[PDB]
Amino acid sequence: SLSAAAQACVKKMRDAKVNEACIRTFIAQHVMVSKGETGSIPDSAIMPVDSLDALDSLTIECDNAVLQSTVVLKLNGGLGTGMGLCDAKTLLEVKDGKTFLDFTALQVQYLRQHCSEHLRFMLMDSFNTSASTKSFLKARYPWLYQVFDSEVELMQNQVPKILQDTLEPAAWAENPAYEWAPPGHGDIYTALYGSGKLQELVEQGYRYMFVSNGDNLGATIDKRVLAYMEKEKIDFLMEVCRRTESDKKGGHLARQTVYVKGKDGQPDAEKRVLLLRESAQCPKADMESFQDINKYSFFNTNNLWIRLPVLLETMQEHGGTLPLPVIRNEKTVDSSNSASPKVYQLETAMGAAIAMFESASAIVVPRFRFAPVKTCADLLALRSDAYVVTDDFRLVLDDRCHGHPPVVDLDSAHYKMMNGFEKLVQHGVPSLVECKRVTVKGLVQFGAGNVLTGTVTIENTDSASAFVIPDGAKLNDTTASP
Numbered sequence: 142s143l144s145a146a147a148q149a150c151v152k153k154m155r156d157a158k159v160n161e162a163c164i165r166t167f168i169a170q171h172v173m174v175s176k177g178e179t180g181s182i183p184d185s186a187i188m189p190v191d192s193l194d195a196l197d198s199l200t201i202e203c204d205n206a207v208l209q210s211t212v213v214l215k216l217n218g219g220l221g222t223g224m225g226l227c228d229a230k231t232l233l234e235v236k237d238g239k240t241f242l243d244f245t246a247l248q249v250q251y252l253r254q255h256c257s258e259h260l261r262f263m264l265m266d267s268f269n270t271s272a273s274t275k276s277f278l279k280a281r282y283p284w285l286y287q288v289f290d291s292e293v294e295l296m297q298n299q300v301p302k303i304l305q306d307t308l309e310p311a312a313w314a315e316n317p318a319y320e321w322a323p324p325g326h327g328d329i330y331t332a333l334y335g336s337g338k339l340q341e342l343v344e345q346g347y348r349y350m351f352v353s354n355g356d357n358l359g360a361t362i363d364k365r366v367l368a369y370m371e372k373e374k375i376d377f378l379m380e381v382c383r384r385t386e387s388d389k390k391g392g393h394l395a396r397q398t399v400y401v402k403g404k405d406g407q408p409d410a411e412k413r414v415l416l417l418r419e420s421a422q423c424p425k426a427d428m429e430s431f432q433d434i435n436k437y438s439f440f441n442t443n444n445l446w447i448r449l450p451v452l453l454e455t456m457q458e459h460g461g462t463l464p465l466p467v468i469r470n471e472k473t474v475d476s477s478n479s480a481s482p483k484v485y486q487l488e489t490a491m492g493a494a495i496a497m498f499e500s501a502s503a504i505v506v507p508r509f510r511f512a513p514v515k516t517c518a519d520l521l522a523l524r525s526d527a528y529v530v531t532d533d534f535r536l537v538l539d540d541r542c543h544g545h546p547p548v549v550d551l552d553s554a555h556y557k558m559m560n561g562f563e564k565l566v567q568h569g570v571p572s573l574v575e576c577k578r579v580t581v582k583g584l585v586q587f588g589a590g591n592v593l594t595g596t597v598t599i600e601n602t603d604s605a606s607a608f609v610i611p612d613g614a615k616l617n618d619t620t621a622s623p
């Protein structure tokens with residue numbers, strides 16, 4: 142039986158007609174929090190992962206049946222606040238005239254032409270992103286618009302922000318919509334389960350789901366991973382990348398060792414169990430451990446494969462929920478207004494489901510399956526010539542890079558927001574394919590047709606006037622200044 146605060150959350154969520162699967166999932170988290178769970182995972186509690194299988198080693202492709210039983214879902218529900226976005230990130234342009242959505246739709250169109258005619262495609266939208274996404278598709282891809290509401294969109298849940306003082310639901314008279322937030326992308330499982338969509342998918346014969354970040358345009362179906370999951374009877378698979386210097390916003394793989402004591406004269410066998418640690422779960426006093434890319438060198442791509450019938454079985458057998466570890470995220474009710482009440486927002490990360498299945502694994506993938514965009518520094522690298530468009534409409538790092546993205550460092554005073562970054566490339570995106578690292582300090586504007594090679598720094602000490610670069614400039618292993 143629940144605390145008074147937890148009952149106040151149930152009542153609020155029921156009055157608003159929140160899905161019961163979501164209420165159950167949230168309340169189980171609310172119980173954890175009220176007992177002192179923060180989501181924190183300290184370094185002393187985990188150990189690094191030393192060896193995994195690699196996609197580059199695999200060669201066998203899955204038969205057509207398996208391919209036909211796969212569904213593709215793109216996450217599209219978050220708000221990239223750090224980039225100063227008030228709408229769906231996937232609408233920003235990534236190449237001249239084309240948005241993340243554009244390439245996403247082109248990926249689906251191509252796959253339907255060349256691999257599986259009846260590929261099921263889904264987008265997980267939220268309150269904050271559904272509107273703009275649907276009208277975009279209405280204009281450019283009517284074949285998706287026709288079945289948007291019918292089979293494309295999965296709407297994610299909203300859960301109450303809770304006051305830190307009491308764990309009660311927050312009230313915000315000035316704008317009650319701010320009392321609610323989407324509960325991270327680990328909600329995909331809840332939303333699929335609670336809407337009946339997961340059982341429908343299983344009923345129609347689908348067996349696998351391939352999920353990836355909306356911002357990652359290298360993530361598509363690779364039939365060798367499906368063959369691999371079939372052979373090895375794997376129910377959940379996380380693709381990880383060898384971590385680079387640019388991999389600082391996200392989570393890394395880790396392991397624990399659980400001892401299953403062996404019966405009948407067979408000794409207790411240590412058995413590895415895998416887990417995800419998001420940056421938000423690192424005790425912030427230990428961030429340097431989280432950020433040491435040698436210690437934890439397997440970075441989650443969020444390219445995730447789920448065996449749908451087993452996910453469904455597992456959630457049925459855990460009270461109609463998937464008990465992902467809660468992440469207790471701290472904010473104010475109006476995140477803009479730091480005079481507003483402090484709240485917790487309970488969230489989960491979908492890659493945390495690796496701890497949920499007995500035969501969950503991770504596989505190392507090459508960097509051409511991971512081109513993330515968390516910051517405008519990423520968007521600069523993606524927009525430039527360091528990233529190329531494949532025939533099947535993935536963006537991938539050019540071969541010259543040897544799987545190392547150009548290390549982009551933009552002054553956060555000027556380029557952290559989208560409006561500032563937009564002026565930086567006002568007159569052109571620099572050629573970056575040959576740039577191992579570009580650092581921009583102070584207010585600066587690229588010219589047209591700039592070529593950067595080696596380690597280039599552009600610096601303006603003056604901090605008043607823009608340092609503008611002349612068309613044609615080619616900076617090589619240098620620091621450029623007014």
Ligand SMILES: O=c1ccn([C@@H]2O[C@H](COP(=O)(O)OP(=O)(O)O[C@H]3O[C@H](CO)[C@@H](O)[C@H](O)[C@H]3O)[C@@H](O)[C@H]2O)c(=O)[nH]1
Binds near residue numbers: 220356
């Ligand atoms: O409630 C939410 C929150 C996010 N998203 C979407 O989910 C994707 C991921 O969000 P993002 O904030 O971009 O990334 P992070 O959550 O920080 O990190 C994810 O992606 C990283 C790699 O890029 C992995 O390392 C992390 O483990 C994984 O959690 C994006 O498409 C968001 O729009 C939602 O749909 N709903």
